Structure formats: C-alpha cells, structure tokens
Design a protein around this ligand. Structure first.
Ligand SMILES: *[C@@H]1O[C@H](CO)[C@@H](O[C@@H]2O[C@H](CO)[C@@H](O)[C@H](O)[C@H]2NC(C)=O)[C@H](O)[C@H]1NC(C)=O
Ligand SMILES: [Ca+2]
Ligand SMILES: [Ca+2]
Length: 275
C-alpha cells in the first residue's frame, strides 16, 4: 500500500464552473478560465491509517473530540444529520463504532482545521478550490464528472454515491453503503481516486457564490468569509436530492464543522519527504 502517494498535476488552463449550473444557489456559474501552475495532489483521500500516523506523531486531538460530538447520518446509526455525542474519527457512528475493520477508508469527522494540521504536518497543504476542481476534471473539458458525462459509463460504477430512495434505503448497488477504501473505483485521467463521491473534501478557499468571468492565475478565492469550501460529494449523494458529485459542484461548512461524510486530501507545490 502507498496511500500517501501523490501524482503530478500538469500546468494548464481550464474552465472552472459552468454556464449550465445544476444548483444555481451554489454559484456554479459563471464558467471562467483559470490558469493553474504544475503541482502535486494526493492520489487518495487521507485514510484512517494515514491520519493515525499523524496523531501518533503529534498527539493531535481533533475538534470533534474536544467538542464531544459530531454529525452522523441517521441511516447508519437536515433531519437525517444528528449531532452524536462521542462520534469522531475513531468512532464514526458514535462511541460503540470503530475503525479497526476499515483502516483504508477515508478519515471522517475532520474539520477544516484538523485537515490543515494534517496536511502541514505531512509537508503539504490543502488544495485551493480551483486546484481541486482542475484535478477533479482529469484533463477533460466541460464534463459533469471526472470521467465524462455518463454516470455509469460502460455500465460500470465509477464513484461511491447513493443508490435507492434517499435517505430511507441505500441499496449498496455500487458495492458500498458507507465509505469505500480510498483506492476503490477507477482513477481519473490524472491518477486520482474517489475525487467525486466517497468522502466530501475540504479545500483552502473561503466560500463565496459571487464570481467574475475574468481570467485568473492560481486563484485563492475571496480574502474573507465565514465558511470554507468543500468539493466532490460523497457516498450520500443522489441525483434526486443532492446532486453534488460533479467537479463543478460546491458546498460549504464553518471551519470547525465535522461530519461522517466529510474528509480531505492534500496537495503540495513540491514533493515532500516521506517514509
Ligand atoms: C499508532 O500507535 C499505536 C500505538 O503504538 C500502534 O499500535 C501498536 O503498534 C505496536 C508496534 O507495531 C504493536 O506491537 C502494538 O500491538 C500496537 N498496539 C496497539 C495499542 O494497537 C499503531 O500501529 C500506530 N498506527 C499507525 C498507523 O502507525
Ligand atoms: Ca454507495
Ligand atoms: Ca471524495
């Protein structure tokens, strides 16, 4: 296993957002041209095992652990998000759950601050929204998903999202009701796994829904805000209710927030030291 490996994301120009927004309230529009310098992106969402290395090294206590609760989806115990006492990265559904059987699944119940701590410890950083979205798109232009416009190309599942009647029944058609291992499903064109679906992913940007059409270079998002941007959707998303497993999709939470469907991956300007 090599679940902290990074891939080189090539220098390029791409179209961020879309002039055909699917959730207009989220500021998916307008489409805008963005230039990104070459950098490195984690191939995988950060796993439980990888986060445990960080915690073993630093003693870091996550915000959910300090607060004493975190949001858990009711179906695996909005009205379906319950603040559960004792839910945190080691106990994803609450005190009597465990990660012992899921070491290679994405770490969950990590806040934006927890994510920044991990990435910086690892000699890395969070990606910007634009870096994240560019990477998500995987060298394709103006497609819904990292792989194209069809949800199930060639009749194959390409991401871990919801099948069935949300939120009452998840059929597990794609092989996973909750999270999947961080190396599940096909990679996109840049070598990234689970960039849509599985766990939501934090980015460094403050959230706004107001974007200009002006061309930008390595944009960092607005200089102020109250919520940070998250991307890519999760195992909970379904076309019928929450259609956010698209590269152009976007949502937000306060930086001290955490939940059972939200994780992260890191980026870096250069290759850090490892092993
Ligand atoms: C995090 O630290 C724990 C505690 O040291 C590690 O678990 C122990 O590892 C030692 C050495 O390999 C084993 O002999 C013990 O059986 C383990 N004890 C416990 C309490 O499980 C753990 O491997 C570390 N995690 C990571 C990802 O490196
Ligand atoms: Ca699924
Ligand atoms: Ca993901």
């Amino acid at each position: 296993l090599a679940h902290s490996k990074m891939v080189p994301i090539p220098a390029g120009v791409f179209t961020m957002g879309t002039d055909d927004p699917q959730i207009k309230q989220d500021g998916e529009a307008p489409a805008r041209r963005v230039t990104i310098d070459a950098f490195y992106m984690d191939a995988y969402e950060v796993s439980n095992t990888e986060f445990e290395k960080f915690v073993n090294s630093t003693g870091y206590l996550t915000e959910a652990e300090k607060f004493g609760d975190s949001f858990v989806f009711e179906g695996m115990l909005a009205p379906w998000w319950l603040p559960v006492k004792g839910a945190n990265w080691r106990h994803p559904e609450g005190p009597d759950s465990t990660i012992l059987h899921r070491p290679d699944h994405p770490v969950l119940h990590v806040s934006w601050n927890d994510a920044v701590a991990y990435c910086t410890w690892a000699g890395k950083r969070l990606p910007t929204e634009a870096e994240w979205e560019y990477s998500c798109r995987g060298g394709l232009h103006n497609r819904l998903f990292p792989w194209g416009n069809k949800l199930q190309p060639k009749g194959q599942h390409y991401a871990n999202i919801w099948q069935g009647e949300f939120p009452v029944t998840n059929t597990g058609e794609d092989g996973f009701q909750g999270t999947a291992p961080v190396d599940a499903f096909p990679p996109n064109g840049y070598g990234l796994y689970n960039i849509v679906g599985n766990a939501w992913e934090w980015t460094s940007d403050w959230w706004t829904v107001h974007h200009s059409v002006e061309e930008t270079l390595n944009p960092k998002g607005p200089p102020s805000g109250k919520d940070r941007v998250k991307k890519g959707g999760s195992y909970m998303c379904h076309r019928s209710y929450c259609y956010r497993y698209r590269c152009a999709a976007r949502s937000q939470n306060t930086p001290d927030s955490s939940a059972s469907n939200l994780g992260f991956r890191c980026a870096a300007d250069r290759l850090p030291t490892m092993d």
